[PDB]
Amino acid sequence: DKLLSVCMNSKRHKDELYQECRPWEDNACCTRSTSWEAHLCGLLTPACRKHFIQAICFHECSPNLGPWIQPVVQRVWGVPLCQEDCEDWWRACHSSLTCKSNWLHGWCLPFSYHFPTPDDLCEKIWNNTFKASPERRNSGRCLQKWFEPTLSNPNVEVALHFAHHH
């Protein structure tokens, strides 16, 4: 689509957002009901679910997903996530357990078993919707799953970097 920032054309995707999806308020690819609805084996930790919902706000609401868009026959394949992202993800969800490794969401063994390494979690989840990046959060070569809404968005310049250099 137009400019540098483009949203994948689909049903789920095209000032007031709910909880973890707030960081993208200034530019977002997801409508309010998408965030609100995004917040809707065994009891899962508050941190683990926090991380999942964060990932959903990222997939739906982020303008920066352009470069990795691949067609279904839209879909996103292997957006690099920073080491700390998948790390805190896999550690928060470590204690928790899960039944199946498909983990199809929107489309009872421990998590560590299905995903021994954070690479396993971020890669195997959603058929490689994310890539496990060796680059740490601050380098600028990897996308940040979540950021505090007040601060500037680190992922813009990265989406440009991958849109041109890669």
Author numbering: 21 to 34, 41 to 66, 79 to 111, 118 to 151, 166 to 224
Quote the study's own text.
A decade-long search for a protein pair mediating this event in mammals culminated in the identification of the glycosylphosphatidylinositol (GPI)-anchored glycoprotein Juno as the egg plasma membrane receptor of sperm Izumo1 1, 2.
A crystal contact, however, fixes the position of the N-glycan at N185, which is neither conserved nor required for secretion (lane 2). Taken together with sequence alignments, these observations suggest that — in addition to key amino acid substitutions such as D103A 1, 4 — structural disorder or displacement of conserved pocket residues important for ligand recognition in FRα contribute to the inability of Juno to bind vitamin B9.
